[PDB]
Design a protein around this ligand. Structure first.
Ligand SMILES: O=C(Cc1ccc(OC(F)(F)F)cc1)Nc1cc(C2CC2)n[nH]1
Length: 287
């Protein structure tokens, strides 16, 4: 670590602090994550190989004095800050479409290697001036497990099967999270901003209807399912994400299917008619 000069704090991650830093030998500007177990070393070392243009590059893994440091590629802005900055006008639909398309390419790659993210949220979607968007913290949930600073870990993008106690969840959990983020880019408001596990689940039920054996076979046997849940009717997506067109509403409905087995895959989502006119615009960024 004597090879890095801290520049400024990026923030407090889930596992530890993130700093912008400079590599004294190569002159490289990086993001350095300080994490404070052998199985974790092996799982993290496997992520160094999982390289894709829409995945934030893991440059190096450093284990010293029982501390673990992850050295990542640096990007100047995250999607949460970009969405806040674009709140008055909204992000233009061609840019939302380009970002969703790129994130689906990222997901299709990681899922093809049987690697899940498990904790997608706007905070870990990073953007550059060229119009690219990249997934950060890919694979860290499986490798490691409130934050170290006691901050509450957000539930807003958590798939219903996790909330219902599924132990062996699938790549479909990442498609759910990305559907929630797509809806938030379009409407400029979080889709399901729950502030507890039951509030998160009931917000989902109030919009998509309380799930039953018809739409989700096996749901009533899930560990945290309760027959006493209130029974809410489903809402139309035309009310949930206006002014998204019919192609975007159809794709969103497939990314938010209750049954993880029915939920669209990233590969099938890339073939959806919503992406017939996709382009790569450049965002307006002030750094
Ligand atoms: O999280 C950001 C955006 C960002 C950049 C600069 C920020 O402000 C600061 F300069 F630090 F004062 C604050 C936020 N990037 C970033 C994070 C990562 C790796 C850890 C995942 N790689 N790249």
């Amino acid at each position: 670590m004597e090879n890095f000069q801290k520049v400024e704090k990026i923030g407090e991650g889930t596992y530890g602090v993130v700093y912008k830093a400079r590599n004294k030998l190569t002159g490289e500007v990086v993001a350095l994550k300080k994490i404070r177990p052998s199985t974790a070393i092996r799982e993290i070392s496997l992520l160094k190989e999982l390289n894709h243009p829409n995945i934030v590059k893991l440059l190096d893994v450093i284990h010293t004095e029982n501390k673990l440091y992850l050295v990542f590629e640096f990007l100047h802005q995250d999607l949460k800050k970009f969405m806040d900055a674009s709140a008055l006008t909204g992000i233009p639909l061609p840019l939302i479409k380009s970002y969703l398309f790129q994130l689906l390419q990222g997901l299709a790659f990681c899922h093809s290697h049987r690697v899940l993210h498990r904790d997608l949220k706007p905070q870990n979607l990073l953007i550059n001036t060229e119009g690219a968007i990249k997934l950060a913290d890919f694979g860290l949930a499986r490798a490691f497990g409130r934050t170290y600073t006691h901050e509450v870990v957000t539930l807003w993008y958590r798939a219903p099967e996790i909330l219902l106690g599924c132990k062996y969840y699938s790549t479909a959990v990442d498609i759910w999270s990305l559907g929630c983020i797509f809806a938030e880019m379009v409407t400029r408001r979080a889709l399901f901003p729950g502030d507890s596990e039951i509030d998160q689940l009931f917000r989902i039920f109030r919009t998509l209807g309380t799930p039953d054996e018809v739409v989700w076979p096996g749901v009533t046997s899930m560990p945290d399912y309760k027959p006493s849940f209130p029974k809410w009717a489903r809402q139309d997506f035309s009310k949930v994400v206006p002014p998204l067109d019919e192609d975007g509403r159809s794709l969103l409905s497939q990314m938010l299917h209750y049954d993880p087995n029915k939920r669209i895959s990233a590969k099938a989502a890339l073939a959806h008619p919503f992406f017939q006119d996709v382009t790569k615009p450049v965002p307006h960024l002030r750094l």
